Design a protein around this ligand. Structure first.
Ligand SMILES: O[C@H]1[C@H](O)[C@@H](O)[C@H](O)[C@@H](O)[C@H]1O
Length: 296
């Protein structure tokens, strides 16, 4: 869906799946920053298809793109395309999740997702000092963000010990509809001993898990749901006392930082560099620390 370049002040931005609310919101911040920087952004949606994303990236290079910002559908699967683009003289920077396993080290702007996952688990260990039964519902399984969030959750619960039980860990592929049915089936499988905490690795899925908890006739005070992203819908649930926590990862700042680096690469050849942002756990006491609180 590319059009011809009119100047050098153009960047191609390839999103993994623009049907995800987190990324729709990220795209809005991208468009603001692009206007402010005087750069045209051409936005491509991979529609959760690695083959399409790879062909999109190849096409952008053929048509003259010199910097591409990519949120890869799968962090390992896009390594070949990134290497090819670099070899052709196209600079690549990743956003939100990384590209890994290739010849070239691709600079990456994202959240510290291990720290984010660890914050969720540390919350569980602090809140349940005698132990707890935990369900983990994971995001986009091929993404570094899922892999690293999961690792941080594992780290914190392993540190807590055998009293902190991961009763099941399943993906809902960053989809609210899958989150509902996946969570329902998990609840049914342990209806005689419901979990204490459902850790959901994005807020869209957390909304589905909250609904599954309600559909099961369970009490959101006894079966607690924690998300990730601090989207306004989740912030409202925390304000209402239905959801306990989420995690702020500053997606506006991620995308703005990637674009700022891209523009400096175009203007002066400045090197693209990795930046990891520290996430912050958001509860009812610090809702205003969420970057999108003004939308709630
Ligand atoms: O950081 C993002 C965010 O959490 C999205 O909501 C999720 O679906 C993606 O998988 C993740 O990489």
């Amino acid at each position: 869906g590319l059009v011809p370049r009119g100047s050098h002040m153009e960047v191609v931005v390839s999103f993994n799946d623009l049907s995800q609310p987190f990324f729709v919101a990220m795209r809005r911040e991208l468009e603001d920053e692009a206007a402010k920087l005087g750069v045209k952004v051409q936005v491509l949606d991979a529609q959760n298809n690695s083959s399409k994303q790879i062909s999109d990236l190849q096409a952008a290079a053929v048509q003259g793109a010199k910097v591409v910002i990519v949120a890869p559908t799968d962090s390992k699967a896009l390594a070949g395309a990134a290497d090819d683009l670099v070899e052709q003289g196209v600079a690549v920077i990743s956003v939100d999740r990384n590209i890994a396993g290739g010849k070239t080290a691709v600079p990456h702007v994202g959240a510290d997702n291990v720290a984010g996952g660890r914050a969720m688990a540390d919350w569980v260990v602090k809140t349940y000092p005698a132990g707890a039964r935990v369900v983990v519902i994971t995001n986009d399984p091929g993404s570094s963000s899922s892999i690293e969030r999961v690792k941080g959750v594992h780290d914190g619960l392993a540190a807590g010990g055998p009293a902190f039980k991961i009763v099941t860990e399943q993906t809902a592929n960053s989809k609210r509809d899958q989150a509902l049915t996946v969570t329902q089936n998990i609840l049914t499988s342990m209806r005689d001993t419901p979990p204490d905490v459902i850790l959901c690795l994005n807020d869209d899925m957390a909304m589905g898990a909250l609904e599954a908890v309600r559909a099961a006739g369970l009490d959101s005070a006894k079966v607690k749901v924690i998300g990730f992203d601090a989207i306004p819908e989740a912030l409202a649930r925390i304000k209402a006392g239905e959801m306990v926590a989420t995690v702020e990862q500053n997606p506006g700042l991620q995308i703005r930082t990637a674009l700022r680096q891209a523009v400096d690469k175009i203007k002066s050849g400045a090197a693209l560099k990795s930046v990891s942002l520290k996430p912050v756990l958001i509860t009812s006491g610090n809702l205003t620390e969420a970057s999108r609180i003004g939308e709630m």
